[PDB]
Predict the structure.
Amino acid sequence: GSMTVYICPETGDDGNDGSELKPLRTLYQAMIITKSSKGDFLIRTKKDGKQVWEAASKTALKKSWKRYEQEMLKNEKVAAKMLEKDATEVGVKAALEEAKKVQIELDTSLSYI
């Protein structure tokens, strides 16, 4: 479990799925999709000229979640898009029964005749 959300304020977008390929542009949305808050959130930073993923800090996380409170606690009409992909499993078996005959020999001799 624990969905890692990737944030690129630079080249991603707040409306994405928050993957490494589709990074979010806000840490706030990372918290929305997962609602894990203290989960693993990685934000791309450019360190020594290279873009790397750095783990979000509790300070930045709470800074993002503080706003989550504001909109979600009061519950305004902004629509917090999470969306699940799919978890639908199908299955059906065919019902049938065996049908055989049996021989039943009876005397039918009549003991009282």
In short: The longest helix spans residues 58-74.
